[PDB]
Design a protein around this ligand. Structure first.
Ligand SMILES: Cc1cc2nc3c(=O)[nH]c(=O)nc-3n(C[C@H](O)[C@H](O)[C@H](O)COP(=O)(O)O)c2cc1C
Length: 159
């Protein structure tokens, strides 16, 4: 079976909890993608056009800095990449992660939490941005359990 990493960004814990359930289900290592500068509540104010998150989402070239890379990334066969949905997209720190780690040859699978939006748009944009990677279809994990995770992974043929 594969060596599995569950990489994730979480600003308020929701995606971290999804990631923990996923990693427990598959016996995967978890890698929290930690921002070098933590996100405050003010940063996350989507009603303020001048908030850090609004400015990020308006600049597709922005690459929020990550504290520490995953040093043994080379050892993994499958890398799940989790995030909260921000304006129907992956947060830009996900781009920082992808661009800073060699994911060539690996199976790469997004997952997300949200306030209602589906994962599809964010996953489509990531696949189009990084078309050389081996992307598989991901899931919104707002409400999940081991049985649902296992069914998903059988559909996409990850083991
Ligand atoms: C800046 C910002 C933008 C968001 N945009 C969306 C959105 O487009 N659609 C949606 O359903 N939820 C949106 N949300 C809600 C988050 O996706 C949701 O609360 C997620 O579970 C937060 O995960 P976390 O606790 O790991 O940070 C947004 C939240 C923030 C802070």
């Amino acid at each position: 079976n594969s060596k599995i990493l569950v990489a994730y960004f979480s600003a308020t814990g929701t995606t971290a909890r999804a990631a923990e359930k996923l990693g427990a289900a598959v016996g995967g290592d978890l890698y929290p993608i930690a921002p070098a500068q933590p996100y405050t509540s003010a940063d996350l104010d989507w009603n303020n056009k001048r908030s850090r998150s609004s400015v990020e989402m308006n600049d597709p070239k922005m690459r929020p800095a990550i504290k520490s890379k995953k040093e043994n990334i080379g050892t993994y066969d499958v890398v799940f990449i989790g995030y909260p949905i921000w304006w129907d997209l992956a947060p830009r720190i996900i781009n920082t992660f992808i661009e800073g780690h060699s994911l060539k040859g690996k199976t790469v699978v997004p997952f997300a939490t949200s306030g209602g939006s589906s994962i599809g748009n964010s996953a489509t944009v990531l696949k189009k941005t990084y078309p050389d990677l081996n992307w598989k279809e991901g899931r919104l994990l707002n409400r999940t359990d081991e049985k649902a995770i296992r069914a998903w992974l059988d559909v996409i043929a990850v083991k």
